[PDB]
Paper text:
The ER membrane protein complex (EMC) has emerged as a conserved player in the process of membrane protein biogenesis. The EMC is an eight (yeast) or nine (mammalian) component, 248–284 kDa complex with considerable mass in the ER lumen, membrane, and cytosol. The EMC is comprised of cytoplasmic, transmembrane, and lumenal domains arranged similarly for yeast and human, despite significant evolutionary separation. The EMC presents two distinct and structurally conserved cavities on opposite sides of the transmembrane core that differ in size, shape, subunit compositions and apparent function.
We obtained reconstructions of yEMC bound to an antigen binding fragment (Fab) and hEMC reconstituted both in detergent micelles and lipid nanodiscs, with the latter strategy yielding the most isotropic and highest resolution data. Comparing detergent and nanodisc maps for both species identified two major gate conformations. One of the conformations, referred to as the closed-gate conformation, results in a more occluded membrane cavity. The yEMC detergent map, yEMC nanodisc map, and hEMC detergent map all show the unassigned helices in the closed conformation, preventing client residence in the gated cavity. The lumenal positioning is consistent for all three of our closed-gate conformation reconstructions (hEMC detergent, yEMC nanodisc, yEMC detergent). Lipid density was resolved at positions along the cavity in hEMC and yEMC cryo-EM maps and the properties of this hydrophobic seal to the lumen are conserved. Yeast EMC2 features a more curved helical arrangement with N- and C-terminal domains in closer proximity to each other than seen in hEMC2. Although yEMC lacks EMC8/9, yEMC4 follows a similar binding trajectory along cytoplasmic yEMC2 and yEMC3 surfaces. The lumenal cap differs between hEMC and yEMC, with a four-bladed distal beta-propeller in yeast and eight-bladed distal propeller the human complex. Upon identifying antibodies against yEMC, we observed that the top two antibodies bind to a similar extended loop in the distal yEMC1 beta-propeller, perhaps suggesting that this site is accessible for co-factor binding in the ER.
Residue numbers in the entry:
A (entry chain F): 12 to 106
B (entry chain B): 3 to 292
C (entry chain D): 8 to 25, 141 to 190
D (entry chain C): 2 to 35, 41 to 83, 122 to 198, 220 to 253
E (entry chain A): 255 to 269, 274 to 284, 287 to 304
F (entry chain E): 2 to 40, 45 to 134
Amino acid sequence: NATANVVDNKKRLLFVQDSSALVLGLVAGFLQIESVHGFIWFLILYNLINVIYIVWICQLQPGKFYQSPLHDIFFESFFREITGFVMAWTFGYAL
Amino acid sequence: KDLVREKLLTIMNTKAYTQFNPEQLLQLENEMKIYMKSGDSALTEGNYFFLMEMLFYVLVYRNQDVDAQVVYNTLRDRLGENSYKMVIMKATLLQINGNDKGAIEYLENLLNDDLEYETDFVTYVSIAKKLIAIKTTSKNLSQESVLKEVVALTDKFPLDAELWWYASEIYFEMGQFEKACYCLEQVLCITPFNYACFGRLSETLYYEALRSKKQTKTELLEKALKNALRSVELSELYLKGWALVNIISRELGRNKQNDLIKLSASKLKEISAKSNNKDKITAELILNKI
Amino acid sequence: EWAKHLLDTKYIEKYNIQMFMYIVFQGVLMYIGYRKLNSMGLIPNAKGDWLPWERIAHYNNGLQWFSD
Amino acid sequence: LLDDQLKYWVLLPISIVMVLTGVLKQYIMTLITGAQPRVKLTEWQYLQWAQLLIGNGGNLSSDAFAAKKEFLVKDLTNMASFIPQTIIMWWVNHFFAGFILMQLPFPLTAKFKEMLQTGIICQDLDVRWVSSISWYFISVLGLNPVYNLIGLNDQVDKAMHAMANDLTIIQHETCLDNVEQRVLKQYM
Amino acid sequence: RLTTNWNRLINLLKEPGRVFTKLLALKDTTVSDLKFGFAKILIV
Amino acid sequence: SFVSKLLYTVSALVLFHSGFSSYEFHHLLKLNSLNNAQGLPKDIMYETYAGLILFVLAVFTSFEKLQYLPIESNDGKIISQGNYLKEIALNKATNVDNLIGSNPNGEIIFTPSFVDVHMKRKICREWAS
Ligand SMILES: [C][C][C][C][C][C][C][C]C(=O)O[C]([C]OC(=O)[C][C][C][C][C][C][C])[C]OP([O])(=O)O[C][C]N([C])([C])[C]
């Protein structure tokens, strides 16, 4: 049914998400965002970047490039990206 | 321009240069070196040396081979002459440099020194394939080469698809058309999603049907449809599967075969649309001829 | 692939013979960690955790009381 | 509080050391990586062929299912975690002790004041003010994206004879019979 | 802001001394004492 | 330099500038508070978000549509699917393979060694030799 080409585009998504969780947080630490506003800010901007990724790079068809796309873009690698955001936010708040 | 890298690596992992005409092979040889020395960025060392040995084989195919010795000298530096690629390369070098057969014996006992698994199994599998390639030319031509493969095949290495595929090709060329079905079925067994072993396994059944009785003809053409439908199911723009389905259904011409004829005609007009290049000329002829 | 197309389209006659249980179980595996290890001292609903959000009661509110 | 320009000499060396020891760990696991008769590999190969004809080739062999089995039966019959994190805790507790490094942006609970402020012997300082070890406790969890971005990557005969006798009529897969329906189920 | 910051960088660009300017370790203690409030006048 | 690396360098410079300006502004809100005995937001914010949006567009404009060269022919004839990623359904994957004149099974189909020996013995005879 499916081939072993999902790994490549999955890796591209992972690179995009990783590179969009260490400039968020750093920006938050530059603005001296406080405890809960920071988390709400991160959730809003991170899901916005996921949506614009679904629109722009993926051509409005999450299927045909991932299987179960709502599971794979949004919920997968979410607790591996809140923590990188926390690291960058702590690094930014201390400068 | 990295698109040339894409073309070269596709030719590499497909080994399509083996099936090249001398004109396009000369074009490949000429256009290799310019990128080889110009576009040196983003290309890994292993790909560097793989391209080097592809150029070695291209030169050995080509008329002049002094650059073959030069390239072999450049590529000798890493992993010497004990790697299976290097062993095959130097065996070919000694076969072509003087048209002397001697390399075989310096290979032969080498195979008899590899029984103790000093290297991987793919190593001396490849060495066995090359020495069969040597010996089919040493005694110019015979059917016994198939026998050699079988005695090399059955005890030692069933898994290798390439050997069974060459056995099936030799059987199909002038031999029996029945054992080729078994060989292709095995090649299908090892590689589950091969979409070109179903086209061959349908073509061989079609060829077996054309000289059969009417009930056996019906059975064989039914099996050809059931085997070509998987080439349809594993690829959309695959030319030969669609052409074969259309041809056999045209030969039968039944009502639901007529449905398949309409669908296959639409798909073959899709293939012969000018997105595809030089496969339109072999699809449109079969479409508009009859 | 013109060659095979040509040889197949025409005629040739030549030969030579010669499920909710998983959810509940994963909930138990999610709840064992909470009960056993995070509930030692690292969870609120203790009174010693809402102390930094309590008021002072502003005792005097009209008085100064200077002294020596 | 008013801390004085010790952010650099604590935050930057710790992050550099974690990145470099991660790279060294990857290289060392690469170098360390964490049958001799032909008959041995031959029998292993035949065993694997039986396995794949059970799983891989036992799907689209509709006519050839019966013919194979006679031939088959006749031929057949955590240091990585423990070393570097302890070493880094040792180094951090040696070089960086009795300091206040920063304040976190989010309020923890008081047991985290117990865990994180080991350097200082005060009693009401805060929960949000942390010693240097806290910077390690976060940098362990959050360094995965940085590692990704910089570029990093990750006796015998009887049993299979019994399964050979088991697989005779276990499942003849309905393939090369229903394929016309599935082709006509799509490509519309 | 861009002009003043870039001119400040350009003026201090020269005077290796670059690595020691990056070091920020190398000092007069009077500014250190005045920054922490250590320096004071006691009126008796 | 095309748009992606340009936007990386510009984003890095803008973010560093905004970070230094925020460092300066937030340092003299405690020092200045101390100088009074314990007694530029908008432009800085807009600059910082401009840098962030530049970085995001620099990460998104690093994707180029896939364009190929045919294996057989020698003219350009760029065979473009107009896609950014690679399909997961095996039908479309083998489709994008078949539009190029190659076959992924490769060695099993061509059996390179045997036809290699036969053709390299053949190549001596032909006219280009
Ligand atoms: C390990 C990751 C760090 C997570 C820390 C939580 C950060 C969110 C947070 O600050 O919420 C705090 C954490 O107060 C507490 O410390 C109680 C924790 C409540 C969550 C427990 C989860 C089981 C509680 O909400 P609050 O409205 O009562 O506090 C006052 C408002 N505030 C100043 C916080 C804006």
